[PDB]
Amino acid sequence: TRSSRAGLQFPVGRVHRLLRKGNYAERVGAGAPVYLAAVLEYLTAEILELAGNAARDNKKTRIIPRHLQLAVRNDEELNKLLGRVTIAQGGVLPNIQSVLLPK
Amino acid sequence: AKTRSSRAGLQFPVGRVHRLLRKGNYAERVGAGAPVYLAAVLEYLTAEILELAGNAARDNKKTRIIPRHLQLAVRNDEELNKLLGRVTIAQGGVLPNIQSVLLPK
């Protein structure tokens, strides 16, 4: 393969196919499906990281959408990135505005 | 006539719109009516706006459309204004609108 040759888990072939057929440019370099597959791989790790963390924190061995949302919205950098994405079955973070609290 | 524009009975250069659509990686291939359509739609809109800008110019007593005139044109038309709801026109200025509660009674 090339996932191997690049130490990647993410399909370096698939990616090269998609770049070419998905109408981004006339021609497509050899480094790019590798560079990109890696960045996709990097980021899917960062999410799986903190979501997993979250599933531990929230006492479950399996990640459901919530654990993603929790991971994402609690991360300052990831929440930005997905600043315009509604994640199905995510709920919201718990935040109860000060002056609403009892005295 | 030679010009594909004339076959189409248009001002916009259908040849140019065809070149760009190809040197633009929107698809493998391009139909032959798609440039025509698009060149015509582009024409509709530049007309629709130049109509309102020139009127805008006229009231401000002017022979020549300057951006304020395009701006006045755009934000007075509910629809154009929405199409360009995210667009700064250089030298556009803003529409004269002063909130009520700031006016003397």
Place this chain on the structure above:
Amino acid sequence: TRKESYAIYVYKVLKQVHPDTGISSKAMSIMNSFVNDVFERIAGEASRLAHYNKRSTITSREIQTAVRLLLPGELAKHAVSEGTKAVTKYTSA
């Protein structure tokens, strides 16, 4: 070198619509952008439409439905009629 521009067409249409009226360097420039913006906007959204429907080619059907997504009503409607008119006309000649 050649800097291509819609400056002649924009003029043409202006002269068609307000025959004793000039346009300034900046205004032209502005206009010039507007055409390019709407071009990409349409073009791109047509490009998505081909793609979404496993399809290799952008035909005026695409460009049309692109227009129906992009533009507000009265603008869209007129633009559509306007456009499909020029197709028809172009076929016949």
Place this chain on the structure above:
Amino acid sequence: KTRKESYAIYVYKVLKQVHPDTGISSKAMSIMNSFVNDVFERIAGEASRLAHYNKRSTITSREIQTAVRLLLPGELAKHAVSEGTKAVTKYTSAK
């Protein structure tokens, strides 16, 4: 019974790489797949304009790179580029 693709299995392999003793649900799996396609388009699309803007016909790792630097927040980009430049050189080792 059509053969529609996804990233499902690689997500897992990466899941194992980070959290070996942990699992996932179908409902979250689509989210991870949606996530991947979305990120793919945004980077690819940025890359695409980059080429055009520069009157050039090829999307290289360099395009893909700067695209990332426009699409990602300071820190997240930082690592991405790292992991990106790494996987590339490592791949150009082998042949």
Place this chain on the structure above:
Amino acid sequence: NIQGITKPAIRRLARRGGVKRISGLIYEETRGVLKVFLENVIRDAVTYTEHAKRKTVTAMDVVYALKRQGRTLYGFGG
């Protein structure tokens, strides 16, 4: 039919919204608001269906509509 969007349901949403106290006219306001939202999303959605020559609006039309409108949603085939 629209008024089938029950007051209690709207109450729940505002609670998940962080909202503590609710005026009466909110409920109706919520409704016009929600209507406007769906209309726009369904107008775009259907357009995709009409263009796919289908009598059945899919998830992907919806998904595509939301993207168009800057309200991207995950978990229905991205």
Place this chain on the structure above:
Amino acid sequence: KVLRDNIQGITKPAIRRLARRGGVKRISGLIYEETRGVLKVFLENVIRDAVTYTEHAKRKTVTAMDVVYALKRQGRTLYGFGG
């Protein structure tokens, strides 16, 4: 030569004039500094991006087009300068 404190070039009258085109009549004193803060987060975005385009185009000169592309990126499309 070294450049320091330039945000204070955004004098209080100006930050005022803008607010007037903005339809504001009464300006609280603590506004001026906030506006400067905001304008900064603003330019730090358009130029972080403009500059990337400039780095990518392998240039030492930032062009009107790198700016215009940046704005478009951040959904603040600008007409009047090319594009």
Place this chain on the structure above:
Amino acid sequence: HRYRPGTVALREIRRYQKSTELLIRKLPFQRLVREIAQDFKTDLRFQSSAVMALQEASEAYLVALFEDTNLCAIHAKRVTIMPKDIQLARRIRGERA
């Protein structure tokens, strides 16, 4: 006995932000969706995922909206949200005119 007005309110907030379940029951919603669409095109069918997608998109949106609404209420030294907040919220979002 009796709980002091606004204290189950706080309790319900806690409950719903902890849960991810949908809050408008599926069928009124489903019938609302079909109504609105028939207005655009006749004799149509919806994928059950198509309706869920819509529902997720709509709710999440409204919640987001109540959040931002509730902040305007608070901005006006109030504690009750009111149609006039929603209007300012959407105005500033640029949704409404």
Place this chain on the structure above:
Amino acid sequence: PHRYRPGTVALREIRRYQKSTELLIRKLPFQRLVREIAQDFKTDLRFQSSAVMALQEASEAYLVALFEDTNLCAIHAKRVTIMPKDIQLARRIRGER
């Protein structure tokens, strides 16, 4: 002598600056600022004079759009005077950070 009452010249100036389109920030201070911020990203950068002018055009539009929506926030809290907290609400709602 003579003295215009408070808020009288404000209203005048509003009408002034709403008639015109010329930039409100001074040209020179502006440039100095932009060079600074850019230097602190990458040294040894030059600017097309029109590229400064682009950023300025874009900057003012934004702040004037901003003041607009800030001003609405003041008027929401039954005030007439804009305040940092107003600006802040507008940016939370715009979804700026």
Place this chain on the structure above:
DNA sequence: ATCAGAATCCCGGTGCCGAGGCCGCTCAATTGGTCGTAGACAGCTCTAGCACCGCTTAAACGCACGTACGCGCTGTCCCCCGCGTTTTAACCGCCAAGGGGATTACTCCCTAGTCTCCAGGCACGTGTCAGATATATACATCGAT
């Protein structure tokens, strides 16, 4: 009520330089003909969606009752506006220098494209446990006192 001056609104003259025009040069579109594959259409297939039916069961509802919040009024205190004088540096149009963009010019490397061979990734298969479900207990409250 009436009066003054301050600002804006408008007037003509005025001097300048940009838009608009004409002229000639070249590059991007036109023309025409081939060739190859996308898409369209027709013919069959089975999957997803719609429909109607009825049981217990939560959720919707409707009213009741009182409380605490919204809102309108008032008064105080103070900050932010206006103005005038002092102060500072923007703007203008003066020239002078060379870094850098943009245009040019040649060779070759990297990628698109074709083919043939090979397993990585997918539908689909089951058995299995993580976890939805809960009933009784453990706790961490809230309101009354």
Place this chain on the structure above:
DNA sequence: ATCGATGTATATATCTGACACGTGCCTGGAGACTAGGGAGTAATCCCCTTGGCGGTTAAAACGCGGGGGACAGCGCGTACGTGCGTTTAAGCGGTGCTAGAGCTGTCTACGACCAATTGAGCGGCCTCGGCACCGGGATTCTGAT
């Protein structure tokens, strides 16, 4: 704070459907290998960007005095939250029926690719008339008396 008292969390027993893992076919990827054109790189000119200086003054700064708004206090009236019992249709589990979407194989209409041919459209140059700038005068209205 201290009461008893909710309603909430935590628990540990059992039940069941989606997970995760394996079966094996297949279609997308990969290795071989040709072909050329995009773009790298090195050479050359020619814009425009920076820099730097004083003549000029419009804009900024700074202080001063008080007008009128921020906001704090309050005081009334009611528009919501709470919560019992009172009314509906949401949902679930079950089967029935087909429209429509999915897949498959064929033919030709249409679009890329290519070459030779030329005025549409561009820059380069030229001129004067729209309009920006200066300066005078009448119209308005705001605030002082």
